[PDB]
């Protein structure tokens, strides 16, 4: 009975790295984007139903390993490629938390509930990162609507103080290239897109369009403000920046 | 315990006794009610925090250098309870 | 204060210094029960000694 | 004795890199507290005040 | 025999152990298996069954906490706040699970008092889950505000921790509407109406109204004046927010 | 005042002093008898005192 928990704690830790178990095997069903795990029969049925509680942590971990594979396969130069670079960071710091648990089994011990309350701080972070990644999996977006999508989710989460901080680090690494190509428009009216990574696309006076494949920051009107600054160069709090940035370069 | 902690006040404050008395009182109160570690023991977690600190500041060379220094500390085989020493130096960077 | 019948208060306190020396509720109870347990046994052993 | 000197040299090097502003005397005291099983969290807080 | 002592630890963790159990109206069921132990420990393990039934009243909320985002913004605070409570239970139980291993908690009069401090907390947190079903504010505020009027100053502190979290989106709608001139509604969990009446050219025409079905009751009835000041002007808190 | 106050401190420090003896010691300090001497003196007198009591 205390022995059947100990080796399954060790098997659970092996899965969470992303590596096949001794008694937990991994079967792809959707191509390992969500893993249909099967733990094989153990003599004690009590420890087997508790082990099942800890396997969806690993299903949500497969969601993020396909996120960082997904944007690389397309070779973007977009801010979606950089959204994944953050999820690789949250993925590097995760690994320290499993490896500690691993260290704790070597000498000294962790029972199943000793496992349970240490996993418990990060299965909640995983599930918020997993749902941003599955909503994004449609083979979209290019620059501006990636940003539009992540802002709505930050304005959703409002009042759970938890995801305000986690969505805070994601939305500023996503904005790290975006405010580059923003400046190029408000001080020179020039474009800097490898693809189309900036909402105001181009093709004097010039033939500007906007697309809703790159939806504006929250509001359509401030994207229209940047339409009107750049012509003149040719001859919550973030959309707010624009309205007075126009009107000091008018 | 009682002596070492008083020594701490004396060197920093650069004053002897009957000068550091009130400070002593804060220190005694705050150390005693939380005497034993409130974290699970683990050398590796603290080390990683020190190297991330180097990377965040873009001091990559020193981050590698540090890795050599921790092996030197560990190897001598004199000080055990190493995590707490390291932990302290990281909090005060 | 300055004492009303004290006047070397530092030395008096000093003399006292030199002569110095859930589960919260079960620690306190456990001690109370264990101290009475010690007593019953010391009276018995003592009577055992006279014989 | 000698290993105890060499070890302190390693620690002084750990201190310079992190900009702690602990001397040879301040570090040696800290170590000694640390070896007796004091919580580093508590210990860091006391230090900050003592510098004030 | 000793297997039975293990089996109850898992009724706190779940609803189910070695024997198949179920919850009906109340209480995790007990099979003590074969006779070979006293007809009187099953009563001990019935006192302990209500804590497995009370665990699963918080557990469904936390399954509803761990959503993409939907069922209130108030309604996802009551559950998120109750999750910070769910994790404190686990650490008591894993330290209680650490006693059971041979070295104690083989005894049963001590499983009883080790869960009694958890019990006083969790039944009023279960009762507060029966007290909720709304997933819009102005009546979820009326839920945690009513448990801070009832006596027993041991449970008054518990329900004060949920009040400040249940209020935390409600106030995030208040100071932002000063700033931007936007109002957050997904389901109408903010207590002002938003396009009740079609827009007209301004004369202070109604397009914001307080509502008599949903109002934060942390506010007496002073919130009425508060929302027509802020709404007109674009076009914890008991009266400590202008 | 001071004596009730001192009698609590004496008790928290578990020293071995009662109210009657403490009062005599206070008058000894004020007459300039060293604390270290006076502590010595209490210990010796007690040891002998107890040896005499067990004989009675």
Swiss-Prot record, chain B:
* Taxonomic superkingdom: Eukaryota
Location of the protein in the cell: Cytoplasm, Cytoskeleton, Microtubule organizing center, Centrosome
Task: Give the family this protein belongs to, as stated in its UniProt record.
Answer: Belongs to the TUBGCP family.
Functional summary from the UniProt entry: Necessary for the recruitment of gamma-tubulin to the centrosome and for the formation of a functional centrosome.
Q: How does it assemble?
A: Interacts with gamma-tubulin.
Kindly provide the name given to this protein in its UniProt entry: Gamma-tubulin complex component 3 homolog
Tell me the name of the encoding gene. tubgcp3
Curated annotation (Swiss-Prot), chain E:
Name the source's superkingdom. Answer: Eukaryota
Record flagged with keyword Cytoplasm: yes
Single GO cellular component annotation?
Answer: cytoplasm
Location (main, coarse) = cytoplasm
Subcellular localization is given as: Cytoplasm, Cytoskeleton, Microtubule organizing center, Centrosome
Q: Name one GO molecular function term.
A: microtubule minus-end binding
Biological process terms in GO annotation:
cytoplasmic microtubule organization; meiotic cell cycle; microtubule nucleation; mitotic cell cycle; spindle assembly
Q: Which UniProt keywords are listed?
A: Cytoplasm, Cytoskeleton, Microtubule
Q: What does this protein do?
A: Necessary for the recruitment of gamma-tubulin to the centrosome and for the formation of a functional centrosome.
Its quaternary organisation is:
Interacts with gamma-tubulin.
Q: Which family does it belong to?
A: Belongs to the TUBGCP family.
Question: What's the name of the protein?
Answer: Gamma-tubulin complex component 3 homolog
Q: Which residues of the full protein are shown?
A: 246 to 530 of 906
Swiss-Prot record, chain F:
Q: Where in the cell is it found?
A: Cytoplasm, Cytoskeleton, Microtubule organizing center, Centrosome; Cytoplasm, Cytoskeleton, Spindle
Which is a GO BP term held by this UniProt record?
Answer: microtubule nucleation by interphase microtubule organizing center
Q: Does the keyword Nucleotide-binding apply?
A: no
Highest taxon above the source species:
Eukaryota
Q: Which GO terms describe its cellular component?
A: centrosome; cytoplasm; gamma-tubulin ring complex; interphase microtubule organizing center; spindle
> What are the alphabetically sorted keywords of the record?
Cytoplasm, Cytoskeleton
* The UniProt record lists the keyword Cytoplasm: yes
Please give the chief subcellular localization of this protein.
Answer: cytoplasm
Annotated family: Belongs to the MOZART1 family.
Please describe what this protein does: Required for gamma-tubulin complex recruitment to the centrosome.
On assembly, the entry states: Part of the gamma-tubulin complex.
Spell out the protein name for this chain: Mitotic-spindle organizing protein 1
Source organism of this protein record: Xenopus laevis (African clawed frog)
Q: Which gene codes for it? A: mzt1
Q: Which residues of the full protein are shown?
A: 13 to 68 of 72
């Amino acid at each position: 009975l205390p022995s059947q928990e100990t080796c399954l704690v060790e098997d659970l830790l092996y899965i969470l790295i992303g590596v096949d178990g001794r008694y937990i095997s991994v079967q792809p069903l959707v191509g390992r984007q969500s893993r249909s795990f099967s733990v094989e029969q153990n003599l004690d049925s009590s420890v087997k139903e508790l082990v099942n509680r800890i396997l969806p942590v690993a299903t949500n971990y497969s969601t993020v390993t396909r996120f960082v594979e997904e944007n690389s396969s397309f070779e973007y130069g977009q801010v979606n490629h950089a959204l994944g670079a953050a999820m690789r960071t949250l993925g590097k710091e995760y690994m320290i938390l499993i490896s500690q648990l691993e260290h704790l089994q070597r000498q000294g011990l962790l029972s199943l509930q000793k496992l349970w309350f240490y996993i418990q701080p990060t299965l909640r972070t995983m599930e918020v990162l997993a749902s941003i990644a599955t909503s994004l999996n449609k083979g979209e977006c290019f620059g501006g609507a990636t940003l539009s999508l992540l802002h709505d989710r930050t304005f959703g989460y409002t009042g759970d103080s938890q995801a305000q901080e986690l969505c805070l680090y994601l939305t500023k690494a996503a904005s790290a290239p975006y405010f580059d190509i923003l400046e190029r428009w408000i001080y020179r009216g020039i474009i800097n897109d490898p693809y189309s990574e900036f909402m105001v696309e181009e093709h004097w006076d010039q033939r500007y369009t906007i697309v809703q494949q790159q939806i504006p920051s929250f509001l359509q009107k401030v994207a229209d403000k940047i339409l009107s600054t750049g012509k003149y160069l040719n001859v919550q709090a973030y959309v707010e920046r624009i309205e007075k940035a126009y009107n000091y370069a008018s | 315990p009682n002596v070492l902690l008083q020594n701490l006040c004396c060197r920093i404050l650069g004053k002897g006794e009957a000068d550091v008395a009130q400070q002593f009182q804060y220190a005694v109160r705050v150390i005693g009610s939380n005497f034993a570690p409130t974290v699970e023991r683990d050398e590796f977690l603290v080390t990683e925090k020190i190297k991330k600190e180097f990377v965040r500041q873009r001091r990559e060379a020193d981050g590698a250098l540090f890795s050599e220094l921790h092996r030197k500390l560990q190897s001598q085989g004199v000080l055990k309870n190493r995590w707490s020493i390291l932990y302290l130096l990281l909090s005060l960077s | 204060s300055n004492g009303i019948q004290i006047s070397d208060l530092h030395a008096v306190l000093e003399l006292l210094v030199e002569l110095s020396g859930v589960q919260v509720f079960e620690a306190d109870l456990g001690t109370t029960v264990a101290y009475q347990e010690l007593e019953i046994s010391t009276t018995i052993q003592r009577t055992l000694q006279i014989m | 004795m000698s290993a105890v000197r060499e070890t302190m040299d390693v620690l002084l090097e750990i201190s310079r890199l992190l900009n702690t502003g602990l001397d040879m005397e301040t570090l040696s005291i800290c170590v000694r507290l640390c070896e007796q099983g004091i919580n580093p969290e508590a210990l860091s807080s006391v230090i900050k005040e003592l510098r004030r | 025999e000793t297997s039975l002592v293990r089996d109850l630890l898992y009724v706190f963790q779940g609803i189910d152990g070695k024997f198949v159990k179920m919850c009906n109206s109340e209480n995790c069921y007990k099979v003590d298996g074969k006779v070979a132990v006293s007809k009187s420990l099953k009563d001990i393990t019935s006192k302990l069954s209500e804590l497995g039934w009370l665990h699963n009243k918080i557990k469904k909320y936390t399954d509803q906490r761990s959503l993409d985002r939907a069922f209130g913004l108030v309604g996802q605070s009551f559950c998120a706040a109750l999750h910070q409570e769910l994790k404190e239970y686990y650490r008591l139980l894993s330290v209680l699970h650490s006693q059971l291993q041979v070295e104690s908690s083989l005894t049963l009069r001590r499983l009883l008092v080790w869960t009694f401090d958890p019990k006083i907390r969790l039944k009023t947190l279960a009762a507060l889950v029966d007290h909720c079903q709304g997933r819009k504010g102005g009546e979820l505020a009326s839920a945690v505000h009513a448990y801070t009027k009832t006596g027993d100053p041991y449970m008054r502190s518990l329900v004060q921790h949920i009040l400040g979290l249940v209020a935390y989106p409600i106030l995030n709608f208040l100071y932002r509407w000063i700033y931007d001139g936007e109002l957050e509604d997904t389901y109408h969990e903010f207590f002002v109406a938003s396009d009740p009446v079609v827009k007209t050219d301004r004369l202070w025409h109604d397009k914001y109204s307080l509502r008599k079905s949903m109002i934060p009751s942390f506010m007496t009835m002073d919130q009425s004046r508060k929302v027509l000041l802020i709404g007109k002007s674009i076009n914890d808190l008991e009266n400590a927010f202008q």
